[PDB]
Amino acid sequence: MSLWQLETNSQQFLPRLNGIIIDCQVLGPQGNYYSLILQMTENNSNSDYQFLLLNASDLTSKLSINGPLPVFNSTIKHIQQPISAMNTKNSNSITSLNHSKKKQSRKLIKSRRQDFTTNVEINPINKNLYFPHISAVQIFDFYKNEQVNYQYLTSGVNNSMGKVRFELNLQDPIITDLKFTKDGQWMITYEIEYPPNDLLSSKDLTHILKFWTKNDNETNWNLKTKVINPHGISVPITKILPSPRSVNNSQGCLTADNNGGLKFWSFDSHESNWCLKKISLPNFNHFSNSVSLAWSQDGSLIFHGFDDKLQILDFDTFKKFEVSEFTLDSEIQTVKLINDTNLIVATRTTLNAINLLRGQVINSFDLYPFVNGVYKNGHMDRLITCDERTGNIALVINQQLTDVPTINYKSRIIIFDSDLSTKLGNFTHHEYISWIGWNYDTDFIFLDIESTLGVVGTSNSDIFAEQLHKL
Amino acid sequence: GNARVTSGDNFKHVTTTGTVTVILSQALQSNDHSLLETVLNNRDERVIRDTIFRLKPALAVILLERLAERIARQTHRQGPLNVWVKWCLIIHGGYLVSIPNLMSTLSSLHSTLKRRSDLLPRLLALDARLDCTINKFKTL
Amino acid sequence: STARPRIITSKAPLLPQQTTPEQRYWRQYTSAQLVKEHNSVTHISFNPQHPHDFAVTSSTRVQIFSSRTRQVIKTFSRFKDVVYSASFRSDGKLLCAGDATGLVSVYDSYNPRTILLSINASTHPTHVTKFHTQDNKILATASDDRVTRLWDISNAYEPQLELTGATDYVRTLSFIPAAPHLVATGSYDGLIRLYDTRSSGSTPIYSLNHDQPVENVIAVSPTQIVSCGGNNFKVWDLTSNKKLYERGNFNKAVTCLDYVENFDSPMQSALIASSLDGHVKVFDPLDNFQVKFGWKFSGPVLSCAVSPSTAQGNRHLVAGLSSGLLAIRTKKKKSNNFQRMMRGSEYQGDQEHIIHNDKVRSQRRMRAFERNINQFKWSEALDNAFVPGMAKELTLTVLQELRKRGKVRVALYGRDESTLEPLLNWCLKGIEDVRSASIVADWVAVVLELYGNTLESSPVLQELMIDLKTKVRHEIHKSKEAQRIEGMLQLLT
Amino acid sequence: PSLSQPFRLATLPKIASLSNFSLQADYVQVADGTFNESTNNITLGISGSSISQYIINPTPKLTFDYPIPSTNIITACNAEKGQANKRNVEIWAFGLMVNKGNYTLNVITKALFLSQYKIKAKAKVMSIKIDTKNSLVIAILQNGLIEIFDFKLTLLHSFDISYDNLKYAKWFTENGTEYVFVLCPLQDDKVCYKLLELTSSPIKELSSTIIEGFSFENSKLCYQFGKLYKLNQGKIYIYSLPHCQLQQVIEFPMVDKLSPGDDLISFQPVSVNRVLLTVNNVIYLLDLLHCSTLSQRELTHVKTFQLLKSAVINSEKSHNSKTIAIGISTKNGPNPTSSLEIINIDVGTNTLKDSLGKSFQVVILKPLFDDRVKCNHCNEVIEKLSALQDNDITSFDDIFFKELKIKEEHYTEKDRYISDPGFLNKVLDLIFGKFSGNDYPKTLTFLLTHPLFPLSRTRNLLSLLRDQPRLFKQAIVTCPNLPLNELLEELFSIRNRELLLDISFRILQDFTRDSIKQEMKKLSKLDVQNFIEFITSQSTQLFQLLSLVLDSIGLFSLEGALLENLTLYIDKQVEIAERNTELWNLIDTLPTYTMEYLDI
RNA sequence: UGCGAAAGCAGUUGAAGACAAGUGCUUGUCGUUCGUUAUAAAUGGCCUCGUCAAACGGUGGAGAGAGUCGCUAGGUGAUCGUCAGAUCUGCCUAGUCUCUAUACAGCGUGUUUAAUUGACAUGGGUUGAUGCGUA
């Protein structure tokens, strides 16, 4: 923000604001306050406005107001990037605006992939809600409905400078996954750093995995360890599963690639850092982004679904149990255990419940009519959520059309008991639900693409006293 | 801050006279770096084979760890010390097969070799660009 | 608005044999002084009290070295034959010494002229003379007579108690802390014998077998004792009467051993053990007595000692060599009218209702390259990278930052051969390192694609690509070779 | 978990009371103090014969025996080691009842006979507990009187539960305090459950509850770690202390088939949530938390085996998974003989690992919704196919595809309904039986592309399909879970270049290098030698497959002359590989005086 | 743009209208529409609140620097040259050998697992800017 002093043409500055300044205004009889609107153009999926009221005397934020800032997979509704000098990834040129509007409307109507699902996390200790914004995490308190913090979790040109013109084509590191250990004292984050264009090393992505800590009183997470290129070079971490309380007191996690490799990391007190305790070889030559991972509560066994095959791996030897292999009709999008007895597996065409004790399927529900090519691989995981006491939930979003598909959507939530025998409840919300997850209490929280978080769950003196107050 | 950076390849927590086998064995057991360096100063490949040939298999595994540390810290010693490593694997290969764990005990070698081999595709690209530009100005 | 982030220095993944907090402490014993004595220095002892002077026994004399000055301040040459100890008492007022003749002499520490007491312990040599730590009046003496007499300073005509039962030379004696009645002796029999002075004595309660002649016995804690003999040192538990740990990393026979606790190091406790192979090594009892540091000396080390826990000044590490050398390593530790006019600065608001603090903490001064990047001086930031005496890692960051900012071509436009060579000179050296190899490739690729024409007309640049071509080809051979050792290594597993 | 072979302890005497095998267990009492995880001694009371102490290891032996008259029945027996006024002594307490007329309570002290005492008990002695710390003997009587005695049988205290006909009493310890719970039958299948605390009065009543629907006559009862297990009519009812509330009911179908009267059942606990159940000569180890049969063993050389007692492991605290149980085995023959036998028991780690796939309890796609939005009979068909004549290809294909409304000859995502495994298996059987030789129906081509092709028919499938090249190729490309063994032998046996590459691609994609290596070790040294020869004569997947062979071949096996030719071949490839890499990168990549002619 | 793995595999980037400039014609544009899954460039760069000195605790290190004609392995030059070799008591690279404030980089010592203090009137004015030091 630049205050031009027109008498001498000088200028005073307020830099490193959280977003580009859509609007400025001087608010007061004596100009006591400045009201600003900030945009946060990093998030291309949505227009994230933040209203800032600064005290003009010392240019300190008197009041900063914004809602939750989720990053959806694709652009929603009629979100348009602001106008810039050039057409870039974060902006539109003068000419590109109209064609961009038309192309976006046509994508929303005609195309079939309509993935707007977003990743969100819930803090077990504090019940705060974590949104992985691009290169930063928002901590948002849904009980008070206010933001509690905004922290940068990656390197990059984040708030060092305001990108302009060609610099606006740069991509900051993207926080792909963010998870908490069951204890809640450790935060595990996975990041992808993208090289700049027009260099030899312009096609080698960098994958970083980080472990952070904080005390309950504190508010800022502290990076304790950093792993560069886990699992190898240019190999993503497709799934992260924090370990159960039984094994290492929840001080461990599992990471899984698209090559079927698994790696178990744990916090070692002697080392005082996280160490790669166990490894499985991603040696066969198969690529697939549809992987899911579940862990039994006792911690004895692990369920690793790779492509169309579910594998039962012993944790102790970190290998197949000595049936281990279950073939599925199509790719596994999700595996979860409602209880230790029953394992619920979602494939791209159906949803099945299989009892481990018998090794037989109890129920199978058709998902193909609703979920055909709408979501990319791995997002049905964030649409399906699972309680540890009562039951699980399925979220199905579908377009409304009247005489060609229309932008407006309708979502339906189904509560299912363990093994999917019966539907405890069936509800309809009038708008696309991006993410539904289980609060550690009985209730479930869900996020709607209007950034709305809903929940599904179970005398003379008397005359004087008035007069004296008026005066 | 003071966080520990690392990588995913660190599997640490998962016949002739003139042989210096006597000096090598003592240096390895006692962790005497100065005594070890004098042994490593020998560069005659005939000696290197013979010393490792008579060296006890158990002590060989510790020798591999030491060479991996010297190679990792000092890249210019990568050449002269590879012959030591290449003979250790050649001669005591049978012993190294019949050992409960390799990655944990040879984690230094795996990390050191992985670092070099990963640079190969980028180095070749630089070689092609340097060769192309060098040829243009020589012929002109 | 938020304060500008500081540029984060590049840190590659950790390599083997990183510096440890225990090593960083012990490397600080830097200043090395080598003193030459007339014969082997057999024993070294530190005064328990301030200023913590230490006494060295060599040949027929005992010398006390100042801690601060690191030089002799007192000399005891009254001994006619060889001297075999110079231990102080707990109070530090007295130091006792033994002789080959068998006479035990107790002098006043810091008064070599006065002799307080002279005891004829035996006709054979008296190698060990130690004051009892708990009780000052009683003095212990062990001789080649194989009887470890317990003397009293008051009664010097007869021993209070005569402990026997050793079938070989007894050259080691230890008092167990918190157990004043218990006394431990180690003989060349290989047996460590424990005696109780409260009882009749003269017969050990039990013996612990070391299997090699015991050179020194030390009590690390009230319940543990560490005994060094032969080629290893073993730690025994008195409650269990069995050895808990054993470390035999030494090559020659370990000779002397000392223990220091509750000193300002990262490690709470340390165990130093001379080797007779030139090595004195530090072990930590809290980590199963694992080695943590070591020093090497010219010849066999017969004695070692470290300054007590409460040194209160520069610490010392002392090593004693059979050649007669003494090695010392040290870790060093207006007008009244004007003041009345300006008098309130000292006040910190202790009596005030409200205390308000808005001063921002002083941040570390930024370097030139960081200032240029902050001010968007891409070309000047590149120039600062290649300056004499610039840290290699610090040069790698500015190159990475400019790449991260997307300013790699922008930094290379207004340049000619004169100002391109510094970048190419570093590239000639940076290509070798694994950390900076990939970054060098990106920058060298651009300069070739951006200065192809200047290359043809400039001879000096041309040789910078001939030799650079030579080196990258060399790195190719190293990277190909590393793949081959990788391949064969997979075969073994 | 495993069940060991029983080994004999002693042969029971031939007494009339012990001749009734059904009631034989009741006439043998096992002391609680002496039989545990760590004790090598067992004190046993055999009615009418004696009370004996036996050492188990290294060899079973009789260490002590106290004779008893043949007319007496042992109702309660206990033995404990402790110090008495101090000498280490072993206190033996046993309560005997003579023809319902007189009940005898006897305590014996031995030096590790120091003294012997005997009194008349008012009613049957059902349970005896010895408290060596306080030098006390506590007896619970069938009339409900809990009497506390010293070692001299001087009555110190007596407490009445106010109920008679007591049927069950069991002692247990929690947090260092002694507790006992009792059950008294009432009328109309009702039972008064009382929990008592042992501490002015030494006995404190903590909980008293009446339980309905609790029958004793056909119920076997045992208690472990705060849980009471009742076995009745094939259902194990779990009641939880201190209030004995019904928590769970577990059905055990293998007992539901038992005719009432002939099958002898015993039921004892062995560890947390795991119990021992015996039906005649079969012994079962069960996990009641996961409802799984951890182990089964049949004793073919005995008619019946009846569990008497088991040493119970607190596996949550103990690293030991091995314990012992004692029972009575009866032999087959006209003159049956009963013997005391001990079984060593491996109980396991108490994880879901042990119970996976071991259930003792023995699909159609459903719409997700019952009821203006953007859209993105098995048996009958088998019967129709079965009715067809042999070798009728057109009819078989027509019925399968037409009835199922399948449009393509290869599986698609629109055939998700047909994915029932049973229906597919029956069709496969028909295809084999109906058709043999050189002509198979197109339905087999569809099935081979089906993701849920049964594993049972994968073996030798390639052997069936070797005749027809097209159908062989189809199985390689898409047939799921083709076992690696047949893929590898076909790899080294087939000379077809195209099939070799396709087989190599399939092997690498679906199997790990560590797995594949083991089978290549099995292959003959000649077959691999021929394979190497072809290489010397996508290609990376073949080369990568070669690298696996050399690892499988190992160090010793390889031969120098062949290694030279292989070395020359690979050196040529490396040079070619380097050449192409250089090409690939290349594809990616004023004078003072001048004389000129003016253009005019 | 679609699919997929990140590699890649297929496929697009059209027409009308209006305006400006140059000469009805040519070119370029679009805060205009229809249809398809579908270089940049107006001299224009980010504030202030406290600096300096000396310590301490973890985290990294290619160590920061100086010698040793002491060893080991290489590469290579001037002149002469009977091609065997000579003088420069040749040079350079790497390792080793000796040594020092770990001498090098970074984060923190508002409470943290751990770890700090001290100096200054944070002003105004005059002179020197051919400043000061060095070759």
PDB file of C-alpha atoms in Angstrom, chain D residues 421-544:
ATOM      1  CA  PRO D 421     -17.760 -64.984  -8.120  1.00  0.00           C
ATOM      2  CA  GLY D 422     -20.035 -68.016  -7.831  1.00  0.00           C
ATOM      3  CA  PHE D 423     -21.761 -67.442 -11.168  1.00  0.00           C
ATOM      4  CA  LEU D 424     -18.418 -67.024 -12.942  1.00  0.00           C
ATOM      5  CA  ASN D 425     -17.006 -70.219 -11.430  1.00  0.00           C
ATOM      6  CA  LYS D 426     -19.966 -72.321 -12.566  1.00  0.00           C
ATOM      7  CA  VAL D 427     -19.713 -70.924 -16.102  1.00  0.00           C
ATOM      8  CA  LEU D 428     -16.003 -71.771 -16.199  1.00  0.00           C
ATOM      9  CA  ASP D 429     -16.754 -75.368 -15.219  1.00  0.00           C
ATOM     10  CA  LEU D 430     -19.314 -75.604 -18.022  1.00  0.00           C
ATOM     11  CA  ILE D 431     -16.842 -74.196 -20.558  1.00  0.00           C
ATOM     12  CA  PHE D 432     -14.292 -76.871 -19.646  1.00  0.00           C
ATOM     13  CA  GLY D 433     -16.814 -79.715 -19.652  1.00  0.00           C
ATOM     14  CA  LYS D 434     -18.799 -78.582 -22.690  1.00  0.00           C
ATOM     15  CA  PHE D 435     -15.764 -77.813 -24.866  1.00  0.00           C
ATOM     16  CA  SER D 436     -12.476 -79.684 -25.233  1.00  0.00           C
ATOM     17  CA  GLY D 437      -9.692 -79.647 -27.803  1.00  0.00           C
ATOM     18  CA  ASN D 438      -9.105 -76.744 -30.193  1.00  0.00           C
ATOM     19  CA  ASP D 439     -12.416 -74.803 -30.016  1.00  0.00           C
ATOM     20  CA  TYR D 440     -13.497 -72.703 -27.018  1.00  0.00           C
ATOM     21  CA  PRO D 441     -16.414 -70.248 -26.797  1.00  0.00           C
ATOM     22  CA  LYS D 442     -16.003 -66.489 -26.889  1.00  0.00           C
ATOM     23  CA  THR D 443     -17.330 -66.409 -23.313  1.00  0.00           C
ATOM     24  CA  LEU D 444     -13.900 -67.591 -22.165  1.00  0.00           C
ATOM     25  CA  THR D 445     -12.362 -64.534 -23.830  1.00  0.00           C
ATOM     26  CA  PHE D 446     -14.769 -62.335 -21.870  1.00  0.00           C
ATOM     27  CA  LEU D 447     -14.035 -64.184 -18.625  1.00  0.00           C
ATOM     28  CA  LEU D 448     -10.270 -63.937 -19.099  1.00  0.00           C
ATOM     29  CA  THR D 449     -10.659 -60.148 -19.158  1.00  0.00           C
ATOM     30  CA  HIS D 450     -12.824 -60.236 -16.028  1.00  0.00           C
ATOM     31  CA  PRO D 451     -11.013 -58.702 -13.013  1.00  0.00           C
ATOM     32  CA  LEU D 452     -12.531 -61.295 -10.643  1.00  0.00           C
ATOM     33  CA  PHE D 453     -11.423 -64.395 -12.539  1.00  0.00           C
ATOM     34  CA  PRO D 454     -11.334 -67.138  -9.860  1.00  0.00           C
ATOM     35  CA  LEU D 455      -7.912 -67.926  -8.430  1.00  0.00           C
ATOM     36  CA  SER D 456      -8.786 -71.632  -8.321  1.00  0.00           C
ATOM     37  CA  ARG D 457      -8.699 -71.828 -12.132  1.00  0.00           C
ATOM     38  CA  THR D 458      -5.553 -69.731 -12.637  1.00  0.00           C
ATOM     39  CA  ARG D 459      -3.245 -72.714 -12.113  1.00  0.00           C
ATOM     40  CA  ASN D 460      -2.430 -74.573 -15.359  1.00  0.00           C
ATOM     41  CA  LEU D 461      -4.570 -72.038 -17.269  1.00  0.00           C
ATOM     42  CA  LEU D 462      -1.676 -71.259 -19.610  1.00  0.00           C
ATOM     43  CA  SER D 463      -1.252 -75.009 -20.104  1.00  0.00           C
ATOM     44  CA  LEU D 464      -4.889 -75.195 -21.208  1.00  0.00           C
ATOM     45  CA  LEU D 465      -4.434 -72.181 -23.504  1.00  0.00           C
ATOM     46  CA  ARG D 466      -1.098 -73.153 -25.094  1.00  0.00           C
ATOM     47  CA  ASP D 467      -2.776 -74.610 -28.189  1.00  0.00           C
ATOM     48  CA  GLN D 468      -4.483 -71.389 -29.316  1.00  0.00           C
ATOM     49  CA  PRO D 469      -2.044 -68.463 -29.766  1.00  0.00           C
ATOM     50  CA  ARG D 470      -4.742 -65.783 -29.583  1.00  0.00           C
ATOM     51  CA  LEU D 471      -6.252 -67.076 -26.339  1.00  0.00           C
ATOM     52  CA  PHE D 472      -2.815 -67.596 -24.791  1.00  0.00           C
ATOM     53  CA  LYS D 473      -1.961 -63.980 -25.605  1.00  0.00           C
ATOM     54  CA  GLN D 474      -5.199 -62.794 -23.995  1.00  0.00           C
ATOM     55  CA  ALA D 475      -4.423 -64.509 -20.687  1.00  0.00           C
ATOM     56  CA  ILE D 476      -0.963 -62.928 -20.505  1.00  0.00           C
ATOM     57  CA  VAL D 477      -2.245 -59.411 -21.126  1.00  0.00           C
ATOM     58  CA  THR D 478      -5.286 -59.234 -18.842  1.00  0.00           C
ATOM     59  CA  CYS D 479      -6.026 -62.426 -16.878  1.00  0.00           C
ATOM     60  CA  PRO D 480      -5.684 -61.499 -13.178  1.00  0.00           C
ATOM     61  CA  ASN D 481      -3.483 -63.313 -10.659  1.00  0.00           C
ATOM     62  CA  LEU D 482      -1.675 -65.592 -13.073  1.00  0.00           C
ATOM     63  CA  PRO D 483       0.816 -67.349 -10.765  1.00  0.00           C
ATOM     64  CA  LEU D 484       4.458 -66.482 -11.295  1.00  0.00           C
ATOM     65  CA  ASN D 485       5.610 -70.099 -11.588  1.00  0.00           C
ATOM     66  CA  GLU D 486       3.898 -70.756 -14.924  1.00  0.00           C
ATOM     67  CA  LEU D 487       4.881 -67.325 -16.245  1.00  0.00           C
ATOM     68  CA  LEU D 488       8.564 -68.015 -15.607  1.00  0.00           C
ATOM     69  CA  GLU D 489       8.658 -71.500 -17.131  1.00  0.00           C
ATOM     70  CA  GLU D 490       6.855 -70.143 -20.189  1.00  0.00           C
ATOM     71  CA  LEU D 491       9.373 -67.286 -20.261  1.00  0.00           C
ATOM     72  CA  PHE D 492      12.371 -69.623 -20.523  1.00  0.00           C
ATOM     73  CA  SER D 493      10.587 -72.215 -22.688  1.00  0.00           C
ATOM     74  CA  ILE D 494       8.987 -70.006 -25.359  1.00  0.00           C
ATOM     75  CA  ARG D 495      11.210 -69.031 -28.288  1.00  0.00           C
ATOM     76  CA  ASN D 496       8.704 -66.504 -29.693  1.00  0.00           C
ATOM     77  CA  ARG D 497      10.283 -63.061 -29.410  1.00  0.00           C
ATOM     78  CA  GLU D 498       6.961 -61.219 -29.143  1.00  0.00           C
ATOM     79  CA  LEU D 499       5.606 -63.455 -26.371  1.00  0.00           C
ATOM     80  CA  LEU D 500       8.894 -63.181 -24.471  1.00  0.00           C
ATOM     81  CA  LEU D 501       8.628 -59.395 -24.260  1.00  0.00           C
ATOM     82  CA  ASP D 502       4.942 -59.530 -23.310  1.00  0.00           C
ATOM     83  CA  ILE D 503       5.627 -62.150 -20.635  1.00  0.00           C
ATOM     84  CA  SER D 504       8.506 -60.062 -19.289  1.00  0.00           C
ATOM     85  CA  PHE D 505       6.323 -56.961 -19.068  1.00  0.00           C
ATOM     86  CA  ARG D 506       3.609 -58.846 -17.190  1.00  0.00           C
ATOM     87  CA  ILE D 507       6.028 -60.434 -14.713  1.00  0.00           C
ATOM     88  CA  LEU D 508       7.659 -57.143 -13.735  1.00  0.00           C
ATOM     89  CA  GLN D 509       4.394 -55.228 -13.384  1.00  0.00           C
ATOM     90  CA  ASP D 510       2.586 -57.620 -11.025  1.00  0.00           C
ATOM     91  CA  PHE D 511       5.455 -59.138  -8.979  1.00  0.00           C
ATOM     92  CA  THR D 512       8.274 -57.732  -6.864  1.00  0.00           C
ATOM     93  CA  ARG D 513      11.958 -58.284  -7.590  1.00  0.00           C
ATOM     94  CA  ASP D 514      12.485 -59.965  -4.221  1.00  0.00           C
ATOM     95  CA  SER D 515       9.609 -62.331  -4.996  1.00  0.00           C
ATOM     96  CA  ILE D 516      10.620 -63.053  -8.595  1.00  0.00           C
ATOM     97  CA  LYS D 517      14.225 -63.753  -7.594  1.00  0.00           C
ATOM     98  CA  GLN D 518      13.298 -66.784  -5.490  1.00  0.00           C
ATOM     99  CA  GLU D 519      11.642 -68.608  -8.389  1.00  0.00           C
ATOM    100  CA  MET D 520      14.492 -67.851 -10.798  1.00  0.00           C
ATOM    101  CA  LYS D 521      16.727 -69.683  -8.328  1.00  0.00           C
ATOM    102  CA  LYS D 522      14.550 -72.768  -8.829  1.00  0.00           C
ATOM    103  CA  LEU D 523      14.893 -72.677 -12.622  1.00  0.00           C
ATOM    104  CA  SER D 524      17.450 -75.003 -14.181  1.00  0.00           C
ATOM    105  CA  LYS D 525      20.923 -73.709 -14.981  1.00  0.00           C
ATOM    106  CA  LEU D 526      20.444 -74.701 -18.623  1.00  0.00           C
ATOM    107  CA  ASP D 527      17.174 -72.804 -19.101  1.00  0.00           C
ATOM    108  CA  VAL D 528      18.700 -69.570 -17.808  1.00  0.00           C
ATOM    109  CA  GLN D 529      21.778 -70.269 -19.935  1.00  0.00           C
ATOM    110  CA  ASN D 530      19.637 -70.420 -23.074  1.00  0.00           C
ATOM    111  CA  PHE D 531      17.821 -67.248 -22.037  1.00  0.00           C
ATOM    112  CA  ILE D 532      21.135 -65.415 -21.686  1.00  0.00           C
ATOM    113  CA  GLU D 533      22.111 -66.633 -25.161  1.00  0.00           C
ATOM    114  CA  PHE D 534      19.064 -64.959 -26.723  1.00  0.00           C
ATOM    115  CA  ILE D 535      20.042 -61.641 -25.133  1.00  0.00           C
ATOM    116  CA  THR D 536      23.520 -61.755 -26.668  1.00  0.00           C
ATOM    117  CA  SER D 537      22.106 -62.647 -30.106  1.00  0.00           C
ATOM    118  CA  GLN D 538      10.576 -52.304 -23.646  1.00  0.00           C
ATOM    119  CA  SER D 539      14.003 -53.873 -24.097  1.00  0.00           C
ATOM    120  CA  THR D 540      14.882 -52.395 -20.702  1.00  0.00           C
ATOM    121  CA  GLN D 541      12.197 -54.552 -19.115  1.00  0.00           C
ATOM    122  CA  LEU D 542      13.991 -57.489 -20.720  1.00  0.00           C
ATOM    123  CA  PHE D 543      17.387 -56.172 -19.603  1.00  0.00           C
ATOM    124  CA  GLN D 544      16.002 -55.486 -16.134  1.00  0.00           C
TER     125      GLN D 544
END
